[PDB]
């Protein structure tokens, strides 16, 4: 019973939980994020994940291939999924570069982010305890910004390519290359350690968080909504995007993984178990982070909203602080970042495998013709690496933020989710889909799933996608920095590179297929056997 969950759950429990959810929650002012978060969870999160698993089992094919047997017109969903994955794999691994650099910096008698007598520091520094006594700065935040990140004043100023992080990206990509080449997977005796250790570390950090003198204010900030001010579009898209990103839906790798599953199991109950497990770990890491932030507010004498970066760096500001308040800091630092790498890589391997096993479908007689696969993996890793380098320049943080918002996040996931639900529920037919599910697992989806696909999910996706474009506000890196319009254009280009796959494939397949126009439409709407 546990063996399967222990093996597979690590594939998409990952940085989305321990890293992304906390900084998106902080960015959106804490507890206000939870309302739309759970609304999306129980409206579209679990049902759409179940639907993806059902598609995977039903069609036994990857994203590029399966939709041919459901609705040929909307096969563009496969290319959208594959390109979303091909963009996620580029920037998702950059987080592991920072984690690796932190880990290699941990091998010291005293941690570099514990004090600010070190060289890279501004003269405006003071140790947190001394900030009680202005423009004062905290050693952890400026370590993050100037040693690890060496943050340039803007995306317009890429600066030098940091060799110490470039070699980290190389190391992580070599790990991925050899693991995917050798077919390494969580099935050996190491599975227990690899799957259990992250949760033990999360328990440790949870207890370290709640015990601190300032934890209560942090939890109050974490759990108290402000509905009267914060119900702008940003929180709604961020919550829906977080749900869709964490469950890895609309990526197509879920359908690829699901194709290996067995139909004899109670897929419904297992989907509920996996969803509850993942959302619970996210929600609990929320307590850990925000109790640490409450302590930072207590110690520094600034409001909780101002203590740390309102951006990707939050985890690398919060946890590095936490390990500075535990006995023998170096031991916990090494454990934490080895844990973070083990948590991220086990999921990075799954996407990369999905990417390869999907791309082979574009030319199986040429890419899968033999030894070529061992070279194709090297090609994919090389191209992803050389694109990753852009995020490792001194200005790379802004590029990473732009990618993290637009490339595999935001309106594009809403777009793909809307089209999946719309196709299956209305073009293919919810009743036909329920009959197929009856054949597969022996019982119909029921009302919750049926209405989630037919009404709730389309309404939520379209509502957010419209609301933001009505109440639009642009991206920022921290609370202050505003992107130039050309960078916003690049971000929208990353987003649209996946969205346009559906309309363009519709056009391509209408034009290619013969006959009068209604014949074309009907012939491409009706499923292949």
């Amino acid at each position, epitope marked *: 019973k546990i063996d399967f969950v222990l093996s597979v759950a690590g594939g998409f429990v990952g940085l989305g939980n321990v890293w992304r959810f906390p900084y998106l929650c902080y960015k959106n002012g804490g507890g206000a994020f939870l309302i739309p978060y759970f609304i999306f969870l129980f409206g579209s999160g679990l049902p759409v994940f179940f639907l993806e698993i059902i598609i995977g089992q039903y069609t036994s094919e990857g994203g590029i291939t399966c939709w041919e047997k459901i609705c040929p017109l909307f096969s563009g969903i496969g290319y959208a999924s594959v390109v979303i994955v091909s963009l996620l794999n580029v920037y998702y691994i950059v987080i592991l570069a920072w984690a690796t650099y932190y880990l290699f910096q941990s091998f010291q008698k005293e941690l570099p982010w514990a004090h600010c007598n070190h060289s890279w520091n501004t003269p405006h520094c003071m140790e947190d305890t001394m900030r009680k006594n202005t423009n004062f700065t905290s050693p952890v935040i400026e370590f993050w910004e100037r040693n690890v990140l060496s943050l340039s004043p803007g995306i317009d100023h890429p600066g030098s390519l940091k060799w110490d992080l470039a070699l980290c990206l190389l190391l992580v990509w070599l790990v991925c290359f050899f693991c995917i080449w050798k077919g390494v997977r969580s099935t050996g005796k190491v599975v227990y350690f690899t799957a259990t250790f992250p949760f033990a570390m999360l328990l440790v950090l949870l207890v370290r968080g709640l015990t601190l003198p300032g934890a209560g204010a942090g939890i109050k900030f974490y759990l108290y909504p402000d509905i009267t001010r914060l119900e702008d579009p940003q929180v709604w898209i961020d919550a829906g995007t977080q749900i869709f990103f964490s469950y890895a839906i609309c990526l197509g790798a879920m359908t690829s993984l699901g194709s290996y599953n067995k139909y*004899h199991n109670n897929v419904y109950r297992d989907c509920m178990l996996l969803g509850c497990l993942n959302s619970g770990t996210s929600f609990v890491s929320g307590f850990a982070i925000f109790s640490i932030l409450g302590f930072m507010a207590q110690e520094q004498g600034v409001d909780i909203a101002d203590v740390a970066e309102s951006g990707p760096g939050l985890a690398f500001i919060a946890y590095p602080k936490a390990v500075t308040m535990m006995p023998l800091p170096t031991f916990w630092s090494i454990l934490f970042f080895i844990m973070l790498l083990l948590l991220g890589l086990d999921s990075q391997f799954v996407e990369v495998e999905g990417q390869i096993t999907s791309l082979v479908d574009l030319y199986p007689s040429f890419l899968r013709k033999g030894y070529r696969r061992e070279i194709f993996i090297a090609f994919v890793c090389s191209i992803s690496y050389l694109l990753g380098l852009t995020m490792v320049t001194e200005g790379g943080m802004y590029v990473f933020q732009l990618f993290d918002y637009y490339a595999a996040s935001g309106v594009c996931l809403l777009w793909v989710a809307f089209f999946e639900c719309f196709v299956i529920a209305w073009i293919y037919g919810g009743n036909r889909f329920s*009959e*197929d599910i*009856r054949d597969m697992i*022996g019982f*119909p989806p029921g009302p919750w799933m049926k209405y989630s696909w037919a009404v709730i999910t389309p309404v939520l996706c379209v509502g957010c996608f419209i609301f933001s474009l009505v109440k639009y506000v642009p991206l920022t890196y921290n609370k202050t920095y505003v992107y130039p319009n050309w960078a916003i254009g690049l971000g929208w280009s990353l987003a649209l590179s996946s969205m346009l796959c559906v309309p363009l494939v519709i056009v391509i397949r209408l034009c290619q297929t013969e006959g009068p126009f209604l014949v074309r439409v009907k012939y491409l709407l009706t499923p292949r056997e």
Partner: antibody
Framework: EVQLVESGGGLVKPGGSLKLSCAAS????????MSWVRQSPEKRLEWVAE????????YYSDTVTGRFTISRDNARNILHLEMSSLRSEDTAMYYC????????????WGQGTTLTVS | ENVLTQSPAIMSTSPGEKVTMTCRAS???????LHWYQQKSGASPKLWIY???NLASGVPARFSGSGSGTSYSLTISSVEAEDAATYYC?????????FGSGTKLEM
């Protein structure tokens, strides 16, 4: 209250053909899979054929897979079974049964109709 | 086809006594896919148990079931004259669907 009522059973010569009917009421007939189950004169039960809720998937027992055709009429809310060449072993009492959830057995059974091949 | 057989085809019984009967399969059947039906003399069968243990809507609480894999059983805590009937075990895991040989309580 749910209702199931078979009809059309009767007397046939060996190798003859006959068509059974099973009227349904009290539930959305298009939303539930339906099955025919057969009781021998020795009172032994045997399964015959299942038709899915919509009708895209159909299953037959190996003893009838070549001779019996199942069908449904969702608009008329009636279940049909057609027998092409009734062998000596096919004489029995035929029940139509509602079977949507495989993890919940057959929910309800019709009154049934006898069939004889004398 | 997965043949199912039931152990005590015919059974003597008296009111108030406890009763038990078993069902065996030629192949393993999941806990969720085996069901029991009651047939009164000269009447259509009715669903009686629809899992390893789950009781039907109208069955008296005195009934119970158990088992997994290749073996299953049904039991009655204390019988009554109203329970004189024939009981069939049925597997729902894989086609062709099969009913057990059935067991009759004679009193």
């Amino acid at each position: 209250e749910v209702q199931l009522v078979e009809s059309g059973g009767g007397l046939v010569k060996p190798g003859g053909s006959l068509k059974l009917s099973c009227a349904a009421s009290g539930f959305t007939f298009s939303s539930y899979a339906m099955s025919w189950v057969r009781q021998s004169p020795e009172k032994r039960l045997e399964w015959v054929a299942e038709i899915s809720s919509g009708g895209r998937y159909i299953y037959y027992s190996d003893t009838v897979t070549g001779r019996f055709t199942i069908s449904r009429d969702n608009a008329r809310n009636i279940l049909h079974l057609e027998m092409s060449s009734l062998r000596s072993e096919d004489t029995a009492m035929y029940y139509c049964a509602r079977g949507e959830v495989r993890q919940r057995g057959f929910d309800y059974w019709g009154q049934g109709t006898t069939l004889t091949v004398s | 086809e997965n043949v199912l057989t039931q152990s005590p085809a015919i059974m003597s019984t008296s009111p108030g006594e406890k009763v038990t009967m078993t069902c065996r399969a030629s192949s393993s059947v999941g806990s969720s896919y085996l069901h029991w039906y009651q047939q009164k003399s000269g009447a259509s069968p009715k669903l009686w148990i629809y899992s390893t243990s789950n009781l039907a809507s109208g069955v008296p609480a005195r009934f119970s079931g158990s088992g997994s894999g290749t073996s299953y059983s049904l039991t009655i805590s204390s019988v009554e004259a109203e329970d004189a009937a024939t009981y069939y075990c049925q597997q729902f895991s894989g086609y062709p669907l099969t009913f057990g040989s059935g067991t009759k309580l004679e009193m």
